[PDB]
Amino acid sequence: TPSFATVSPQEVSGSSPAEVQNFVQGSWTASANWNWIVDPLNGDKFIKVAEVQGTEIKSFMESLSKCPKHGLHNPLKAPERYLMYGDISAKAAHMLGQPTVLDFFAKLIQRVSPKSYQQALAEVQVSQKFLENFCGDQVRFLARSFAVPGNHLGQRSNGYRWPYGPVAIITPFNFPLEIPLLQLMGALYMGNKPVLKVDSKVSIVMEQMIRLLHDCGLPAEDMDFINSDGAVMNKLLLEANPKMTLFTGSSRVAEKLAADLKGRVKLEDAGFDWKILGPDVQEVDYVAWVCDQDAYACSGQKCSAQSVLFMHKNWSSSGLLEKMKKLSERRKLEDLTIGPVLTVTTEAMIEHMNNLLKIRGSKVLFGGEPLANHSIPKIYGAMKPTAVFVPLEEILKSGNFELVTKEIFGPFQVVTEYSEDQLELVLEACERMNAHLTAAIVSNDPLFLQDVLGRSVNGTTYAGIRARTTGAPQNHWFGPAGDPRGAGIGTPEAIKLVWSCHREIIYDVGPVPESWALPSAT
Amino acid sequence: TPSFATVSPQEVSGSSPAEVQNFVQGSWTASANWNWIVDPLNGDKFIKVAEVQGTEIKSFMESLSKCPKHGLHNPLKAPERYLMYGDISAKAAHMLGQPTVLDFFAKLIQRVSPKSYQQALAEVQVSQKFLENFCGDQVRFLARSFAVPGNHLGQRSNGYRWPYGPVAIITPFNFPLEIPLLQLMGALYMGNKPVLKVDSKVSIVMEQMIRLLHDCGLPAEDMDFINSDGAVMNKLLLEANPKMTLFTGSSRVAEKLAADLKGRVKLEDAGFDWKILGPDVQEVDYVAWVCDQDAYACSGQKCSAQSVLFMHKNWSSSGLLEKMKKLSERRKLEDLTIGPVLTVTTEAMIEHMNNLLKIRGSKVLFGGEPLANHSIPKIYGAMKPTAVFVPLEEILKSGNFELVTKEIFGPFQVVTEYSEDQLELVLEACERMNAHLTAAIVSNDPLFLQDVLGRSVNGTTYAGIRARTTGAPQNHWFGPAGDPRGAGIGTPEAIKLVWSCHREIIYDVGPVPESWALPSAT
Amino acid sequence: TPSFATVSPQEVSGSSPAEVQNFVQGSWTASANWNWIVDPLNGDKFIKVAEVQGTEIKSFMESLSKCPKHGLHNPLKAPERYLMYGDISAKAAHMLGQPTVLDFFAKLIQRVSPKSYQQALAEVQVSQKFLENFCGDQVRFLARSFAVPGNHLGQRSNGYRWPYGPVAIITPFNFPLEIPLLQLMGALYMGNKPVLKVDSKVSIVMEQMIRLLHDCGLPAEDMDFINSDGAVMNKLLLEANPKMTLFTGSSRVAEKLAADLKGRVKLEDAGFDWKILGPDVQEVDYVAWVCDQDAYACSGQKCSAQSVLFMHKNWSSSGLLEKMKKLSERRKLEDLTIGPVLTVTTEAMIEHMNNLLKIRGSKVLFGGEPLANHSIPKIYGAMKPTAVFVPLEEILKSGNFELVTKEIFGPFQVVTEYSEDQLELVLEACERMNAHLTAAIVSNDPLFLQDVLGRSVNGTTYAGIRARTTGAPQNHWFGPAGDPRGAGIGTPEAIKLVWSCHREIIYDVGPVPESWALPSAT
């Protein structure tokens, strides 16, 4: 295991448990009481987390209050800190790129947020590439400003990206590294001081990542790391009053926080993501593979996962559904191509399936049964990949729509069919949804693509015969649309939008014209 | 006729000839060295152009020398001039938008650069809309700068768009208003002082437009306007040493000036513009219409005109050629849908056709005969719209290729056919051309489009079943690619590229650090 | 020495000579005859260079002709090559950052282009940081394009950065690594295939750098490396007809090439760089140190070196000149804070000094004598740091001006004085210069700064009490202004301006309106 590590991903078990600590006011620290996380594969108490209680959050308040509203740095103050984070990112990117460190983080991710080794590796690879994008001067370049000449000699107006100062970051279980690391660095790049909270089930990953970052030069005083339940984190937000809060998680918590913080938030909330198949049937094998990966990689536990499939009638005879069935059935627990579902129980998923089956014309296409021969504790779901057909005309009906468009954060999707005359019904269904995260339009017809795109919203939409719903890398935006609170992640634009605000500084140095005379009052 | 005007477009004739003067050092000249321009439709000496002679360029040299290399203004000097040119632009845009003024310029363009009323009107409309793009603060916004934080407190680097100062603009006969106006305003916008030369055959249009610009507030000392033959203008360029020269015209003169001026030029030179038809045959009527307009509007006297058509074999049975033939034959002199060819004689075009007809397998598809019942002087061509088919495999042979790809600035195009297995031969043909101005790829197949687009160069390429080669408006770039001297026109980027250069200003105001001691010498 | 190295910088001597080879068509190759470079410190034949003759350049022509005008890659073709160069740059940046590799290149630079160890190290550090700026997706991001909606459904216009294809790079002796490496990578990033020529006196450095780059994944076929005299390189340019040529060197060769190539060039030519001291005297020690480093680091062999100093009269009593004298006299050969002058002999520098001393009121302030106790061959100069005062009023006179503003690529500067009433004379002198590279305005008075800046041109101007003329790093532009051929180096903007051109691609896919009917011809 690497030098910075305090845990061995393959060793940690009920008999060799690991602990996760907080970091506040520059040092690693425990708490009054520990909480046990169980191994999602067997129920072992294998990680204890130093969860802070509601009356031991003063140190985090005090640490945040040390950051003024003009930031740890800004384009005019301590600019050498932009260069430092270029260097930190370079050292960290080189560390994350080491095969043994890649494997360490991929394995650690697997133990807490169960997914296949390649899916866990992809999280580290995205993280590594993101850090490579902000080496050298590239953090400095995030603080690029513009200027425009004024109305007279000596006047020129400037637009800067100003930090917010004390901020908070809250991220969920399913991506224990990629989401928190990318928002953490973005916040630091623009000059904020963040407090980072990761779901206690998986926070061990970012804890190890923070130790690496400290070894790469991240200053002890620049950030804090808190482990707690949601209720304590809520109290800290209302007591510390951070100037910006990045929240990534369920839509229920996002709206509650948006109300509590009175909109001083950026949100990456839930998504009910759709894939539309166009009329031009082709590359059936490739499209089927993407459908299986979109819907069922990580057992569907992606905010970008394919939750509904609108099949054009031309695809009904293609063999696509048959290939999707076969592809779902080679997924298995032993390599975690199917696995524990950390936020939906098996009963909840079965009940949802049965509720859908009450609808006229509906039928299970494949799956619909629990996994067998496993030791997954009953708090976590264990389902075979499931797809349920529901006729399009029934979906559009009231009551049925809210049920059909309900997000199941597990390996579960709804499939439906539309004829050449029914594209409006499909677009009506997409417009009636409450979430606009990812989407895919599988067609190469430019008239079909531009029609669907122009009459849709989703903030990360893929278009083309190779279109997918999942796997947004760091080279382009990922985030919802249709919401002024919508957060992005990864790109320079996402960092600047989420972690800075506009400040206009207008210079007006003179000279006062020699012919100037006191005008009449106005 | 409008207030600013000194000529009536419908009344100028041999019995009532018009005078065109020069503008230098803030005054309209009174030169008597008339160059008599003949009416392209009947041969009347209907315009006397006061052309500057050898010794008379000293006034223009002196006027340009009054502008320093830091411009009439720049982002830090006399910035109120940016606002002034927004106001001039708004006033000129409103004047050009007046129906009687639109008509006046359309009809005047017709008299000197014979083309249909709608084509002439389109030139005024592009000019009017371009001026609308630079009202208010939009000239100010052209001088937008960027800045980056430095390595320490008090250091910040700035990137500005600096003028060149004294500059020159030379434009051809075919667009008497759009080209000179758009480059003139672009030069003035960025802080330069231009001398403008329009081809004497058509310079009456800019003369009137300059009078309009003066009525809208263009300062008398901000630009000069010279009429001369090419040899006199060449002498002025070598004597005045302008820091930038925008030249639009023939490739031969372009390369001569680029050598003479040692590359202190931006060029819009000739173009041998091509259209490729893809395999997906559709909208035959529309595609035939666009082909007819691309090739023969203004009798082909557009630098963007369609000079060769690569037909996919699938199009050979579509009726496309038959429709092109019918469409060409409704062009007539009465509305100037066919007309005088100001730079290529009838005999020259017939000779070129007969040279192409020596090649094996070639044929006249339509046209190939002079126009009848007209009084166009013999110095100007008068040809029916002409298309010569040449087999693709013959086109690619050496000797043939140079003849086939010779630009005929008249109503003439080459037509060829390629089978599904010969796209490489078409692309080799386009790559062996020396000019890369406009192009069209008539296809909605995205795999074909990206393949041809990825393996071509032309700076203004249209793609889609509605793709054309002509008619680039002010909302997007027009100009060649593949040349560091390539000029753009119309857009904010084109203006900044052609009429400004980068200047970096790095502020380093201190404080001299507490820790600073005199470092050892390096 | 590092693994990629074929030379030991500290070992190479007359008795242990090194050789420099060409790289063409994917392999290291010699030539018919070798030319010997002498050690600038003692005259030893210590490096033999495989200089190609005029009749052995066919392989370089053939290698360049393999690159089409649509590049080795472009935004639509082989885009994975953008990612590859992100990876290559990351591997190279990590290699250059290794202390032993830094020291290797710093020492090798010192042997061929003599300068202090810290100055040579600064070249490697700039190179290392530049490569760090283009890791991950940052090369991909250089190919960022924009788009604007069209006039109707299905129409949208796009502006891309297109490569030129086969290009050439020519760089001088004084920066054997920084200049060629940064332009080489810039050319490759945008999709060009360059042939790189470095002054044979120092080309050993880039030869070692290319071996490192090959170890980091630079494809064998992506670039060529030619060693030759200027005359052979001239023939190659006219025979291979590269689509773009980056030239950095003397103003004489730059203008000749700009004429031969008819302006298909970008130039980083000579500079006569000025420093103006404002009226507000302060930080005299700091200002003196910067004056000594600007004028005399590398013995003045920087295109950015301080060649003239306009002293405001307020500074005459500050002790500045006295400190400048003392600072110049602690420079010595043994640590190369003074040293060989590779392109100006001692006699030439003495003669220039004596020519200046013929001017009334002129006097040597310090220096003016050759170095002693050295073995520098007489082809190279060996002068003590020299500053000559010339009264401002005499400078402005004809004849005197051309002599005073003559660039001496050695440790030599002119000092003059201006009173509070004479700022116009200083600005007149700056406007009358023929080169506008670097400049410094040493003042914190914003009215003085904006007045001088607004009435000057130089493309890399520093302003503030800490203003300098030398040492432009990779985080901001370096390059001249006032020239459409002006090149930049280092920054993303510099790379895009120098190594790509605009291509506009306008999509127009339909639909053709159902109500469309063939309009009358225009």
Side-chain angles (χ1 to χ4, degrees), chain A residues 86-87 90 94 129 132-138 140-141 144 153-154 156 446-447 450 474-475 492-493 509-511, chain C residues 86-87 90 94 129 132-138 140-141 144 153-154 156 446-447 450 474-475 492-493 509-511:
Chain A
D87 287 340
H94 182 251
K129 274 286 171 290
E132 275 197 3
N133 290 343
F134 298 101
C135 303
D137 294 303
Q138 290 295 353
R140 188 219 291 266
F141 288 164
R144 177 187 182 113
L153 177 64
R156 44 211 163 250
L447 308 182
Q450 79 185 4
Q474 76 296 319
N475 45 286
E493 296 80 18
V509 299
Chain C
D87 287 340
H94 182 251
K129 274 286 171 290
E132 275 197 3
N133 290 343
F134 298 101
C135 303
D137 294 303
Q138 290 295 353
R140 188 219 291 266
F141 288 164
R144 177 187 182 113
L153 177 64
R156 44 211 163 250
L447 308 182
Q450 79 185 4
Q474 76 296 319
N475 45 286
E493 296 80 18
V509 299

Side-chain angles (χ1 to χ4, degrees), chain B residues 353-359 361-362 364-429:
Chain B
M353 177 193 70
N354 288 319
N355 283 334
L356 292 165
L357 285 182
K358 295 166 173 167
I359 299 160
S362 65
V364 179
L365 297 176
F366 46 84
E369 290 167 355
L371 289 173
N373 190 48
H374 66 78
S375 286
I376 298 153
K378 273 268 99 177
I379 64 179
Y380 298 153
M383 278 285 295
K384 296 185 181 175
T386 297
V388 174
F389 173 86
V390 187
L392 179 62
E393 302 215 284
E394 305 288 346
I395 285 173
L396 291 175
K397 305 178 179 178
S398 45
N400 282 348
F401 183 86
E402 287 69 29
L403 175 70
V404 173
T405 60
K406 184 185 194 306
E407 192 198 31
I408 305 303
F409 211 67
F412 186 100
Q413 69 177 312
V414 170
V415 175
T416 197
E417 180 196 274
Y418 73 103
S419 73
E420 63 187 357
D421 298 320
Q422 296 181 310
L423 183 60
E424 299 293 316
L425 302 180
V426 171
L427 292 178
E428 173 198 332

